[PDB]
Amino acid sequence: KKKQLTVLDLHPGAGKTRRVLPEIVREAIKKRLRTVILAPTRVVAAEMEEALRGLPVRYMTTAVNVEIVDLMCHATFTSRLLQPIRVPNYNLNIMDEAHFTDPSSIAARGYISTRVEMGEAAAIFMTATPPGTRDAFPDSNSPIMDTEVEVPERAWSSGFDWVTDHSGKTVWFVPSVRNGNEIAACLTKAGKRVIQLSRKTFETEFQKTKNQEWDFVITTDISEMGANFKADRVIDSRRCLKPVILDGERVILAGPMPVTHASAAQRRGRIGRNPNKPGDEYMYGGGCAETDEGHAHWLEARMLLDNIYLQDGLIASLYRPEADKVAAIEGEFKLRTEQRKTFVELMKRGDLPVWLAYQVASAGITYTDRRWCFDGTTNNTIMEDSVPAEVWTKYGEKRVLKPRWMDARVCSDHAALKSFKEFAAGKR
Ligand SMILES: Nc1ncnc2c1ncn2[C@@H]1O[C@H](COP(=O)(O)OP(=O)(O)O)[C@@H](O)[C@H]1O
Ligand SMILES: [Mn+2]
């Protein structure tokens, strides 16, 4: 029904995606409701075509090889809202894995919930862990053995025999890509077969969990968003890096620090999913805390939402239960037409973090002008192998990487640094 936002918060594995979602879609088709289904990732979008097989759904992603029901990724929806492209005023908005804390997912939730509040649409947010969840140990299809235990975050030689004595398969949530690299190298030296997953490698590398033999999957928090494993153990550091905007001028990666209860419940929720296989184990290495408070993703969500047309001059609010996570003045990030296009291109083609893309576009810099990558303060020098990183500019001059605005996420691992060096050199 219109003006209704429903939170479908069945416990993990209860069947929200494979049982309830197809029933909702069939009903929406019957009622001739223009409907959008929002999948967190391309991998999950492919899994949804399997669950929705038969039904007339337009899949707006090349991730599926195959209507009044559209399916697209969370980020695609928000990106299309930001661009001149026409987006239907969907009568029914279904967000699967609606706990995703990516800035584009938060922004989408704010847009959708505002259209519902205005009485223009209906929405269903599907997630075991709605915003504000305080339960890290929800129900599961089969019982879980929960154990609080010290979990290594560096290479080890002794004192953690329980890690390597296990003969099943383990999903291990690490605080960072670099921390996961070190743990992976340690496990590999101990004779284990390890697959590593992160945000930017997920679609490629996740397939290895089906196609290869493995003993451990080392993953950051991307695997909290519908990623399905045939494991019988989760090792959870219970730690994450928190992007924080410091003194309004830079972004640091603070911590590692506790994950939220929702994140911990989602990580544990990778196991206990088979009602016929009890005895899955969850080993956790710390407590939870509300570390989404002040987390840059919710500031970045407001930067996105301030630039989405809703109606005349109105600006969509964040979804009420997560609106308190950021201190921001509504509309303070609204950009005019040309600066907004630069903003969008810096985020898409530029592959820059939202906060950084905003600093560049709001300064009046055009997308291809990379002088700002070199004219920052000395304290903004980016290091590679303990020496200042250097690139050849598009002019042919070798220069130290020293961006005017420093966002730790452009150089937090080797791959991110490689990408930002390519950006500073004008190569995309
Ligand atoms: N490809 C598959 N074939 C059979 N069962 C599956 C498949 N994928 C998931 N399942 C199982 O179906 C049940 C419901 O899954 P799902 O709808 O994803 O749960 P939820 O979305 O509520 O977390 C779970 O036990 C899950 O382990
Ligand atoms: Mn689901």
83, 344 Cβ separation under 8 angstroms: yes
13 lines ligand 1 (CB under 6 A): yes
Are residue 201 and residue 262 in the same domain, yes or no?
Answer: yes
Counting Cα atoms < 13 Å in the Cβ hemisphere of 198 gives 17
Q: Kindly report the CATH number assigned to the domain that includes residue 56.
A: 3.40.50.300
CA-wise closest residue to 354 among 225, 202, 245, 219: 245
DSSP string across 343-396 = HHHHHTTS---HHHHHHHHHTT--TT--GGGT-S-GGGPPEETTEE-EEE-TTS
228 lines ligand 1 (CB under 6 A): yes
90, 108 Cβ separation under 8 angstroms: no
Residue list, annotated binding site? 10-17
Q: Are strands 250-258 and 239-246 parallel, antiparallel or unpaired?
A: antiparallel
C-alpha–C-alpha distance, residues 428 and 426, integer Å: 6
Burial class (CB in 10 A: 0-12, 13-18, 19+), 127: buried
The token duo for 347 is 């985020």
DSSP state of 407: B
CA-wise closest residue to 220 among 198, 200, 253: 198
Q: Is 84 helix (H, G, I), strand (E, B) or coil?
A: coil
310, 114 Cβ separation under 8 angstroms: yes
| Number of C-beta neighbours around residue 285 at 10 A | 17
- Domain residues for the domain of 190 are 145-284
Are residue 18 and residue 99 in the same domain, yes or no?
Answer: yes
270, 223 Cβ separation under 8 angstroms: yes
Are residue 278 and residue 152 in the same domain, yes or no?
Answer: yes
| Torsion from C-alpha of 370, 417, 227, 300, nearest 10 degrees | -40
- How far out from the chain centre does Cα 397 lie? 36
- b/e sequence 287-311, b meaning 16+ C-beta within 10 Å: ebeebbebbbbbbbbbbbbbbbebe
Are residue 165 and residue 277 in the same domain, yes or no?
Answer: yes
Measured from the alpha carbon of residue 18, the closest ligand is: 1
361, 353 Cβ separation under 8 angstroms: no
- Ligand 1 atom nearest residue 20's Cα: 17
Compute, in angstroms, the gap from residue 81 CA to the centroid of ligand 1. Answer: 31
CA-wise closest residue to 355 among 260, 248, 222: 248
Are residue 268 and residue 175 in the same domain, yes or no?
Answer: yes
The token duo for 183 is 């743990």
Are residue 217 and residue 258 in the same domain, yes or no?
Answer: yes
Are residue 28 and residue 156 in the same domain, yes or no?
Answer: no
Distances (CA, A) of 26 to 20, 68, 147: 10, 11, 42
DSSP string across 104-130 = HHHHHHHHHHHHHHTTS-EEEEE-SS-
In this structure, what are the phi and psi dihedrals at residue 140, rounded to the nearest 5 degrees? -145, 165
C-alpha–C-alpha distance, residues 331 and 161, integer Å: 54
Are residue 113 and residue 161 in the same domain, yes or no?
Answer: no
Which amino acid residue places its CA nearest to atom 16 of ligand 1?
A: 15
Residue list, annotated binding site for ATP? 10-17
CA-wise closest residue to 96 among 202, 2, 1, 19: 19
Chain breaks in the chain (C to N over 2.5 A) after: 66
The token duo for 253 is 């990666």
Are residue 117 and residue 218 in the same domain, yes or no?
Answer: no
17 lines ligand 1 (CB under 6 A): yes
The residue whose CB lies within 8 Å of the most ligand 1 atoms, and thus the one to mutate among 8, 209, 230, 273, is 273
Compute, in angstroms, the gap from residue 16 CA to the centroid of ligand 2. Answer: 5
Asked if the peptide bond before residue 278 counts as cis, ω within 30 degrees of 0, the response is: no
Burial class (CB in 10 A: 0-12, 13-18, 19+), 399: middle
364 lines ligand 1 (CB under 6 A): no
325, 300 Cβ separation under 8 angstroms: no
C-alpha–C-alpha distance, residues 174 and 323, integer Å: 28
What ranges make up the beta strands (E) of 13-158? 35-39, 57-59, 69-73, 92-96, 122-126, 144-148
Are residue 28 and residue 118 in the same domain, yes or no?
Answer: yes
The token duo for 366 is 């055009």
Are residue 110 and residue 165 in the same domain, yes or no?
Answer: no
Distances (CA, A) of 63 to 71, 73, 204, 353: 11, 10, 11, 23
Give the resolution to one decimal, in Å.
1.9
The token duo for 334 is 């609204």
Are residue 115 and residue 244 in the same domain, yes or no?
Answer: no
Compute, in angstroms, the gap from residue 322 CA to the centroid of ligand 2. Answer: 20
